Amino acid sequence: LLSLPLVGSLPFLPRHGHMHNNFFKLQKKYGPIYSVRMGTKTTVIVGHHQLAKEVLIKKGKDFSGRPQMATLDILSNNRKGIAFADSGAHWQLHRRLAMATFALFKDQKLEKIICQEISTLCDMLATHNGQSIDISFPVFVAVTNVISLICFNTSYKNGDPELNVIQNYNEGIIDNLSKDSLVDLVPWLKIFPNKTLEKLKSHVKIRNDLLNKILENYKEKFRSDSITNMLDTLMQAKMNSDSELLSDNHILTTIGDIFGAGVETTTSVVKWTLAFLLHNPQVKKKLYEEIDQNVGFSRTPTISDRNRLLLLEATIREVLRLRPVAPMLIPHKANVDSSIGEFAVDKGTEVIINLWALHHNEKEWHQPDQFMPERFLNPAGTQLISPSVSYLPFGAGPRSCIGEILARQELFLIMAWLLQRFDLEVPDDGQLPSLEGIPKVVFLIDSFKVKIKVRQAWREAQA
């Protein structure tokens, strides 16, 4: 009796369980690195930090490419911009300029911009005293203005419906960009009839039309004696072309990525820490104690307070470990014939870092499935530590995040201002938010409500 012919084999079931975790599970069988082939494309998944730091750092330039995806093409306006552009003159140029712009708010100091919008955020939420609300949108508004000031030196006022329009096409872009992660085993979208690409083009069209109208209005405003924002930095470079790479679409797409990344990432991480704090009241209680002691109510928190508020800075680290924004980063591509752990990797191969596997490695983390911000503190709780090298929430090397400083500062200040001023409790109904998560291009959390009430200690300190 003979064996059946085999036309295809996948090591696990599609769309059953999270991809990043199904891949992780395979390591028990095949080791920390292995490959899968879909027609001609070969994809390599790396799930150990040593191999990962070879791919991202030690051989950064070799693997600095991006694979091409049909969905990403629409969003990146055919591989322009930064995040989804292939390695090349255009990618490198815009990344540099973008990084350069952040210099223009170094001691309109970035810390002062952020706290400005947080103050407005906290006054809004104070009116909701005693009510249970979703805080998604108010935070969305806060960070949107920050990124807008950096890009245009403009900010939207409360109730500007352009804010709701932006919220609408961002949710639509994220929803259709990918069912789960950007890492699909099976290219379902080229197989069955679907409106996926149609829908995406419509959300993206609206977004693009909105970014063109800001550009056309700003060409009148642009003056070379003033370089104060990202859009100035980019138009200046165009005019110093005595050029193909600084076309209107190249600039537009780049702003697109920055606007997108600066909002959806930080909002999602803010929602994640609160979710974790409702589930872990002991940690939250100690956070109140901490901030009461080292900051009090004489003033509002500042970047200098990271030195004193260690349990908070540690909490944020633990959330980025447990629920990374990109649990498989963005996929990488081999620009040349190269190797990994002395295994051959041909040019054009897709390389995916399983960051989830790095952050949940039993041999690198104690009880890695548990929320324990303490793990990033010494036993005394007197200074921060780095208990594992297997930790890359922001990536590493040529393709590493470029908003990490901004990112880290926003999260710290938002969480500090809120804890100073607000009791944040479970709503009158007994539900807690599910921590299971939703894997999109971003690792999202199901929307949930939190009862917000102004702190008694905040009121009294006004008398």
Ligand X SMILES: CC(=O)[C@@]1(O)CC[C@H]2[C@@H]3CC=C4C[C@@H](O)CC[C@]4(C)[C@H]3CC[C@@]21C
Q: Where does this chain touch ligand HEM (CB under 6 A) — which range of 126-134, 173-181, 260-268, 359-367? A: 260-268
Residues ≥6 apart with Cβ < 8 Å to 302: 111, 115, 413
User: Would the annotation count 170 as a binding residue?
Assistant: yes
CB 287 within 8 A of CB 311: yes
Residues 79-98 that bind ligand HEM (CB under 6 A): 82-83, 95
117 forms part of the interface with ligand HEM (CB under 6 A): no
269 forms part of the interface with ligand HEM (CB under 6 A): yes
| Per-residue three-class SS string for 15-62 | CCCCHHHHHHHHHHHHCCEEEEEECCEEEEEECCHHHHHHHHHHCCCC
402 binds, among ligand X, ligand HEM, none (CB under 5 to 8 A by kind): ligand HEM
256, 262, 301, 439: which one binds ligand HEM (CB under 6 A):
262
211 binds, among ligand HEM, ligand X, none (CB under 5 to 8 A by kind): none
- Nearest one of 80, 151, 79, 48 to 406, comparing CA atoms: 151
118, 330, 334, 407: which one binds ligand X (CB under 6 A):
330
315 forms part of the interface with ligand HEM (CB under 6 A): no
Q: Residues 10-49 vs ligand HEM: string with x where CB under 6 A?
A: ----------------------------------------
CA distance 262 to 266: 7
CA distance 405 to 253: 22
Collapsing DSSP to helix, strand or coil, 101 comes out as helix
CA distance 148 to 230: 10
H/E stretch holding 70: helix 70-75
Q: Residues 432-461 vs ligand X: string with x where CB under 6 A?
A: ---------xx-------------------
Backbone angles phi, psi at 299, to 5 degrees: -150, 175
46, 255, 401, 415: which one binds ligand HEM (CB under 6 A):
401
User: Would the annotation count 401 as a binding residue?
Assistant: yes
Give the residues lining the site for ligand HEM (CB under 6 A).
82-83, 95, 257-258, 261-262, 265-266, 269, 320, 325-326, 329-330, 393-395, 399-403, 406-407
Give the residues lining the site for ligand X (CB under 6 A).
83, 170, 173-174, 257, 260-261, 264-265, 325-326, 330, 441-442
Binding-site positions for heme = 401
